[PDB]
Amino acid sequence: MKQIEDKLEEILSKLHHICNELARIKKLLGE
Amino acid sequence: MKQIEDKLEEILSKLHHICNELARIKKLLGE
Amino acid sequence: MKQIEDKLEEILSKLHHICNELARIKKLLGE
Amino acid sequence: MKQIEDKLEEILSKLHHICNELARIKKLLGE
């Protein structure tokens, strides 16, 4: 269960790179 | 194209909301 | 904790609409 | 544009992998 709670944070971090990346996509699509 | 952008903006907003959801399950479990 | 385990599934389902939607975007970007 | 598509394909593959990650935390907790 700190097993769980720390995978959950790794998932968080990856979800944030993802959001960074859709936003950058969105920025290109826009130029 | 304004419609691809609008979707991307809306995907991001559903991401961010899942990110909040998840950080809170992280909260809980750390209890 | 079935509280937790069922939010986790709602999150799953939303992550799947998301993937459906990036793929459809990707399909438009491609025509 | 082939590069937007390639990214989108790669975001989706990181999603799908988070989806698997999460369904398994769901597994665990249902124990």
mmCIF file of all heavy atoms in Angstrom, chain D, unseen atoms left out:
data_model
loop_
_atom_site.group_PDB
_atom_site.id
_atom_site.type_symbol
_atom_site.label_atom_id
_atom_site.label_comp_id
_atom_site.label_asym_id
_atom_site.label_seq_id
_atom_site.Cartn_x
_atom_site.Cartn_y
_atom_site.Cartn_z
ATOM 1 N N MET D 1 3.075 17.753 -39.160
ATOM 2 C CA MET D 1 1.780 17.073 -39.286
ATOM 3 C C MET D 1 1.924 15.487 -39.179
ATOM 4 O O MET D 1 1.173 14.817 -38.446
ATOM 5 C CB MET D 1 0.901 17.572 -40.432
ATOM 6 C CG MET D 1 -0.517 17.251 -40.275
ATOM 7 S SD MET D 1 -1.531 18.196 -38.977
ATOM 8 C CE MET D 1 -0.530 19.851 -39.137
ATOM 9 N N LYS D 2 2.914 14.907 -39.810
ATOM 10 C CA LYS D 2 3.237 13.502 -39.623
ATOM 11 C C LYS D 2 3.840 13.496 -38.288
ATOM 12 O O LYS D 2 3.760 12.503 -37.632
ATOM 13 C CB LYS D 2 4.159 12.773 -40.662
ATOM 14 N N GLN D 3 4.396 14.588 -37.789
ATOM 15 C CA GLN D 3 4.990 14.591 -36.493
ATOM 16 C C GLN D 3 3.806 14.799 -35.435
ATOM 17 O O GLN D 3 3.800 14.211 -34.464
ATOM 18 C CB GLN D 3 6.108 15.637 -36.488
ATOM 19 N N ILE D 4 2.743 15.540 -35.688
ATOM 20 C CA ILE D 4 1.648 15.647 -34.753
ATOM 21 C C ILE D 4 1.007 14.253 -34.584
ATOM 22 O O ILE D 4 0.793 13.792 -33.514
ATOM 23 C CB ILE D 4 0.645 16.739 -35.198
ATOM 24 C CG1 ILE D 4 1.122 18.125 -34.802
ATOM 25 C CG2 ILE D 4 -0.713 16.581 -34.563
ATOM 26 C CD1 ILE D 4 0.366 19.209 -35.679
ATOM 27 N N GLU D 5 0.723 13.623 -35.644
ATOM 28 C CA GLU D 5 0.234 12.246 -35.639
ATOM 29 C C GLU D 5 1.030 11.230 -34.923
ATOM 30 O O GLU D 5 0.517 10.461 -34.189
ATOM 31 C CB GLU D 5 -0.143 11.736 -37.065
ATOM 32 C CG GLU D 5 -0.856 12.802 -37.942
ATOM 33 N N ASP D 6 2.331 11.371 -35.033
ATOM 34 C CA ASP D 6 3.232 10.450 -34.368
ATOM 35 C C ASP D 6 3.254 10.599 -32.865
ATOM 36 O O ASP D 6 3.371 9.595 -32.182
ATOM 37 C CB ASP D 6 4.578 10.552 -34.875
ATOM 38 C CG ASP D 6 4.791 9.820 -36.247
ATOM 39 O OD1 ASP D 6 3.964 9.185 -36.966
ATOM 40 O OD2 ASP D 6 5.887 10.106 -36.760
ATOM 41 N N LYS D 7 3.130 11.789 -32.417
ATOM 42 C CA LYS D 7 2.962 12.162 -31.034
ATOM 43 C C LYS D 7 1.719 11.755 -30.482
ATOM 44 O O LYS D 7 1.691 11.284 -29.366
ATOM 45 C CB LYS D 7 3.152 13.748 -30.874
ATOM 46 C CG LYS D 7 3.525 14.340 -29.484
ATOM 47 C CD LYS D 7 5.050 14.066 -28.826
ATOM 48 N N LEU D 8 0.648 12.090 -31.113
ATOM 49 C CA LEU D 8 -0.699 11.614 -30.712
ATOM 50 C C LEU D 8 -0.640 10.092 -30.525
ATOM 51 O O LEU D 8 -1.079 9.619 -29.488
ATOM 52 C CB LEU D 8 -1.772 11.924 -31.753
ATOM 53 C CG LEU D 8 -2.140 13.309 -31.575
ATOM 54 C CD1 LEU D 8 -2.955 13.636 -32.684
ATOM 55 C CD2 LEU D 8 -2.928 13.532 -30.217
ATOM 56 N N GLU D 9 -0.073 9.325 -31.496
ATOM 57 C CA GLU D 9 0.096 7.821 -31.382
ATOM 58 C C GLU D 9 0.920 7.441 -30.244
ATOM 59 O O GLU D 9 0.724 6.584 -29.370
ATOM 60 C CB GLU D 9 0.478 7.331 -32.749
ATOM 61 C CG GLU D 9 1.690 6.611 -32.993
ATOM 62 N N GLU D 10 1.908 8.180 -29.995
ATOM 63 C CA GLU D 10 2.648 7.907 -28.789
ATOM 64 C C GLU D 10 2.005 8.303 -27.399
ATOM 65 O O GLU D 10 2.153 7.619 -26.462
ATOM 66 C CB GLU D 10 3.983 8.575 -29.034
ATOM 67 C CG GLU D 10 4.473 9.184 -27.784
ATOM 68 N N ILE D 11 1.229 9.358 -27.315
ATOM 69 C CA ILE D 11 0.409 9.697 -26.192
ATOM 70 C C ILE D 11 -0.546 8.663 -25.956
ATOM 71 O O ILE D 11 -0.735 8.314 -24.832
ATOM 72 C CB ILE D 11 -0.282 11.023 -26.498
ATOM 73 C CG1 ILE D 11 0.682 12.242 -26.288
ATOM 74 C CG2 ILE D 11 -1.436 11.235 -25.641
ATOM 75 C CD1 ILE D 11 0.253 13.520 -26.784
ATOM 76 N N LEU D 12 -1.235 8.163 -26.988
ATOM 77 C CA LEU D 12 -2.150 7.080 -26.769
ATOM 78 C C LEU D 12 -1.599 5.936 -26.242
ATOM 79 O O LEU D 12 -2.266 5.290 -25.457
ATOM 80 C CB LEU D 12 -2.802 6.652 -28.070
ATOM 81 C CG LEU D 12 -3.860 7.692 -28.418
ATOM 82 C CD1 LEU D 12 -3.951 7.649 -29.875
ATOM 83 C CD2 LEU D 12 -5.169 7.246 -27.750
ATOM 84 N N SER D 13 -0.360 5.571 -26.649
ATOM 85 C CA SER D 13 0.320 4.376 -26.075
ATOM 86 C C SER D 13 0.763 4.557 -24.599
ATOM 87 O O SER D 13 0.529 3.640 -23.795
ATOM 88 C CB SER D 13 1.394 3.984 -27.018
ATOM 89 O OG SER D 13 2.356 3.012 -26.570
ATOM 90 N N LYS D 14 1.098 5.772 -24.148
ATOM 91 C CA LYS D 14 1.244 6.023 -22.776
ATOM 92 C C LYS D 14 0.023 6.048 -21.960
ATOM 93 O O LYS D 14 0.008 5.500 -20.868
ATOM 94 C CB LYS D 14 2.068 7.241 -22.560
ATOM 95 C CG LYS D 14 3.347 7.307 -23.213
ATOM 96 C CD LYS D 14 3.943 8.700 -23.292
ATOM 97 N N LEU D 15 -1.079 6.523 -22.508
ATOM 98 C CA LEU D 15 -2.431 6.270 -21.930
ATOM 99 C C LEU D 15 -2.831 4.901 -21.715
ATOM 100 O O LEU D 15 -3.366 4.528 -20.693
ATOM 101 C CB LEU D 15 -3.505 6.979 -22.726
ATOM 102 C CG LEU D 15 -3.266 8.503 -22.456
ATOM 103 C CD1 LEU D 15 -4.092 9.234 -23.411
ATOM 104 C CD2 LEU D 15 -3.650 8.912 -21.101
ATOM 105 N N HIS D 16 -2.686 4.117 -22.693
ATOM 106 C CA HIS D 16 -3.087 2.769 -22.562
ATOM 107 C C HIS D 16 -2.241 2.159 -21.529
ATOM 108 O O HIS D 16 -2.714 1.336 -20.811
ATOM 109 C CB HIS D 16 -2.874 1.944 -23.915
ATOM 110 C CG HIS D 16 -3.835 2.224 -25.013
ATOM 111 N ND1 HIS D 16 -5.055 2.863 -24.804
ATOM 112 C CD2 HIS D 16 -3.647 2.242 -26.353
ATOM 113 C CE1 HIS D 16 -5.613 3.165 -25.979
ATOM 114 N NE2 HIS D 16 -4.768 2.831 -26.916
ATOM 115 N N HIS D 17 -0.926 2.439 -21.485
ATOM 116 C CA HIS D 17 -0.265 1.845 -20.450
ATOM 117 C C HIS D 17 -0.655 2.240 -18.907
ATOM 118 O O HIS D 17 -0.709 1.419 -17.949
ATOM 119 C CB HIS D 17 1.177 2.057 -20.715
ATOM 120 C CG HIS D 17 2.047 1.578 -19.599
ATOM 121 N ND1 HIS D 17 2.070 0.243 -19.169
ATOM 122 C CD2 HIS D 17 2.878 2.269 -18.778
ATOM 123 C CE1 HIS D 17 2.940 0.150 -18.172
ATOM 124 N NE2 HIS D 17 3.467 1.350 -17.944
ATOM 125 N N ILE D 18 -0.964 3.483 -18.704
ATOM 126 C CA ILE D 18 -1.577 4.034 -17.459
ATOM 127 C C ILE D 18 -2.848 3.407 -17.220
ATOM 128 O O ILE D 18 -3.160 3.181 -16.088
ATOM 129 C CB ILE D 18 -1.754 5.580 -17.620
ATOM 130 C CG1 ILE D 18 -0.392 6.321 -17.414
ATOM 131 C CG2 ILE D 18 -2.784 6.113 -16.763
ATOM 132 C CD1 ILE D 18 -0.345 7.735 -18.053
ATOM 133 N N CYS D 19 -3.665 3.196 -18.229
ATOM 134 C CA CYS D 19 -4.905 2.410 -18.018
ATOM 135 C C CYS D 19 -4.676 0.951 -17.443
ATOM 136 O O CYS D 19 -5.306 0.385 -16.396
ATOM 137 C CB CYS D 19 -5.639 2.362 -19.331
ATOM 138 S SG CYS D 19 -6.502 3.890 -19.783
ATOM 139 N N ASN D 20 -3.659 0.307 -17.946
ATOM 140 C CA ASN D 20 -3.343 -0.937 -17.385
ATOM 141 C C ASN D 20 -2.833 -0.823 -15.914
ATOM 142 O O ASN D 20 -3.210 -1.503 -15.090
ATOM 143 C CB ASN D 20 -2.206 -1.528 -18.253
ATOM 144 C CG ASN D 20 -2.787 -2.130 -19.696
ATOM 145 O OD1 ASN D 20 -3.939 -2.614 -19.768
ATOM 146 N ND2 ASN D 20 -2.044 -1.870 -20.773
ATOM 147 N N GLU D 21 -1.841 -0.057 -15.692
ATOM 148 C CA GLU D 21 -1.510 0.369 -14.357
ATOM 149 C C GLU D 21 -2.600 0.688 -13.366
ATOM 150 O O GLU D 21 -2.762 0.088 -12.357
ATOM 151 C CB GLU D 21 -0.591 1.499 -14.530
ATOM 152 C CG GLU D 21 0.773 1.015 -14.959
ATOM 153 C CD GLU D 21 1.835 2.147 -14.888
ATOM 154 O OE1 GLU D 21 2.064 2.960 -15.795
ATOM 155 O OE2 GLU D 21 2.516 2.363 -13.857
ATOM 156 N N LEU D 22 -3.501 1.472 -13.725
ATOM 157 C CA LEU D 22 -4.618 1.721 -12.909
ATOM 158 C C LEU D 22 -5.546 0.567 -12.704
ATOM 159 O O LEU D 22 -6.207 0.542 -11.672
ATOM 160 C CB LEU D 22 -5.463 2.860 -13.557
ATOM 161 C CG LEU D 22 -4.814 4.312 -13.479
ATOM 162 C CD1 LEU D 22 -5.688 5.260 -14.118
ATOM 163 C CD2 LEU D 22 -4.650 4.670 -11.965
ATOM 164 N N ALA D 23 -5.777 -0.317 -13.677
ATOM 165 C CA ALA D 23 -6.794 -1.417 -13.464
ATOM 166 C C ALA D 23 -6.394 -2.553 -12.501
ATOM 167 O O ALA D 23 -7.274 -3.305 -11.970
ATOM 168 C CB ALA D 23 -7.177 -2.070 -14.760
ATOM 169 N N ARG D 24 -5.122 -2.557 -12.293
ATOM 170 C CA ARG D 24 -4.408 -3.322 -11.439
ATOM 171 C C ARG D 24 -4.282 -2.811 -10.041
ATOM 172 O O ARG D 24 -4.146 -3.567 -9.143
ATOM 173 C CB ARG D 24 -3.051 -3.386 -12.047
ATOM 174 C CG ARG D 24 -2.077 -2.803 -11.269
ATOM 175 N N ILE D 25 -4.147 -1.516 -9.839
ATOM 176 C CA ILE D 25 -4.374 -0.929 -8.564
ATOM 177 C C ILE D 25 -5.839 -1.236 -8.310
ATOM 178 O O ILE D 25 -6.206 -1.862 -7.332
ATOM 179 C CB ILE D 25 -4.033 0.485 -8.733
ATOM 180 C CG1 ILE D 25 -2.618 0.680 -8.721
ATOM 181 C CG2 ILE D 25 -4.661 1.488 -7.628
ATOM 182 C CD1 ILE D 25 -2.217 2.054 -9.045
ATOM 183 N N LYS D 26 -6.764 -0.953 -9.191
ATOM 184 C CA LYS D 26 -8.120 -1.454 -8.871
ATOM 185 C C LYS D 26 -8.105 -2.876 -8.435
ATOM 186 O O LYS D 26 -9.077 -3.173 -7.704
ATOM 187 C CB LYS D 26 -9.054 -1.492 -9.981
ATOM 188 C CG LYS D 26 -10.159 -0.713 -9.714
ATOM 189 C CD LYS D 26 -11.322 -0.747 -10.596
ATOM 190 C CE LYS D 26 -12.292 -1.859 -10.198
ATOM 191 N NZ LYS D 26 -13.668 -1.396 -10.264
ATOM 192 N N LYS D 27 -7.116 -3.755 -8.848
ATOM 193 C CA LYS D 27 -7.238 -5.250 -8.638
ATOM 194 C C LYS D 27 -7.017 -5.571 -7.202
ATOM 195 O O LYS D 27 -7.857 -6.182 -6.605
ATOM 196 C CB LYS D 27 -6.258 -6.117 -9.463
ATOM 197 C CG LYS D 27 -6.837 -6.979 -10.531
ATOM 198 N N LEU D 28 -5.839 -5.146 -6.788
ATOM 199 C CA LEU D 28 -5.274 -4.978 -5.522
ATOM 200 C C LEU D 28 -6.112 -4.517 -4.421
ATOM 201 O O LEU D 28 -6.028 -5.069 -3.348
ATOM 202 C CB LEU D 28 -4.250 -3.858 -5.656
ATOM 203 C CG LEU D 28 -2.969 -4.511 -5.983
ATOM 204 C CD1 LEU D 28 -3.181 -5.484 -6.996
ATOM 205 C CD2 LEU D 28 -1.998 -3.793 -6.494
ATOM 206 N N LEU D 29 -6.811 -3.451 -4.623
ATOM 207 C CA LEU D 29 -7.602 -2.828 -3.615
ATOM 208 C C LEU D 29 -8.890 -3.616 -3.381
ATOM 209 O O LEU D 29 -9.525 -3.598 -2.322
ATOM 210 C CB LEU D 29 -7.875 -1.307 -3.960
ATOM 211 C CG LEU D 29 -6.739 -0.162 -4.052
ATOM 212 C CD1 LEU D 29 -7.459 1.255 -4.564
ATOM 213 C CD2 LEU D 29 -5.842 -0.022 -2.868
ATOM 214 N N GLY D 30 -9.279 -4.341 -4.362
ATOM 215 C CA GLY D 30 -10.460 -5.210 -4.267
ATOM 216 C C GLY D 30 -10.385 -6.578 -3.538
ATOM 217 O O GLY D 30 -11.473 -7.285 -3.242
ATOM 218 N N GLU D 31 -9.088 -6.914 -3.365
ATOM 219 C CA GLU D 31 -8.463 -7.736 -2.375
ATOM 220 C C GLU D 31 -8.771 -6.872 -1.049
ATOM 221 O O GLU D 31 -7.914 -6.599 -0.147
ATOM 222 C CB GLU D 31 -6.964 -7.909 -2.811
#
